UniProtKB/Swiss-Prot annotation:
It is found in: Periplasm. Residues 1-127 form the Plastocyanin-like domain. This is Azurin. InterPro entries: Azurin, BlueCu_1, BlueCu_1_BS, Cu-binding_ET, Cupredoxin. It comes from the Bacteria. One of its GO terms (molecular function) is identical protein binding. The lineage of its organism: Bacteria, Pseudomonadati, Pseudomonadota, Gammaproteobacteria, Pseudomonadales.
Length: 127
């Protein structure tokens, strides 16, 4: 009911590569967890949503901000929603308003930990 459970592992994989948000949802939650034994400074994962157009600027601004800032640009207005950066055994959650989304506009989800975005991305669609 308006949520999705997603795992990021030690092989730089999310266990899903497309998310559908029911247009009847007013709020959507992602619950992210890290299986596998690698710590945050080495295999850090987050979930960040932007438009497809904005993803490259977010990833590259995020790398420039460092582990200090969970590899995101503070108050990045291109970020529709994001979790915390997590390592092995931690979990994190974000809810967001579906009013921030529109049908047929392209959203991506991705990890901004350095170089992770090449494998760790997928589509987010308002059905
Ligand atoms: Ca949270
Ligand atoms: Co990652």
């Amino acid at each position: 009911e308006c949520s999705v459970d997603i795992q990021g592992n030690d092989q730089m994989q999310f266990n899903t590569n497309a998310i559908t948000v029911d247009k009847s949802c007013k709020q959507f939650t992602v619950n992210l967890s890290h299986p596998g034994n690698l710590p945050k400074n080495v295999m850090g994962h987050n979930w960040v949503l932007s438009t497809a157009a904005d993803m490259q600027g977010v990833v590259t601004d995020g790398m420039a901000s460092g582990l200090d800032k969970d590899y995101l640009k503070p108050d990045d207005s291109r970020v529709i929603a994001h979790t915390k950066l997590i390592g092995s055994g931690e979990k994190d959650s974000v809810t967001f308003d579906v009013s921030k989304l529109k049908e047929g506009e392209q959203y991506m989800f991705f990890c901004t930990f350095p170089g992770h975005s090449a494998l760790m991305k997928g589509t987010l669609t308002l059905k």
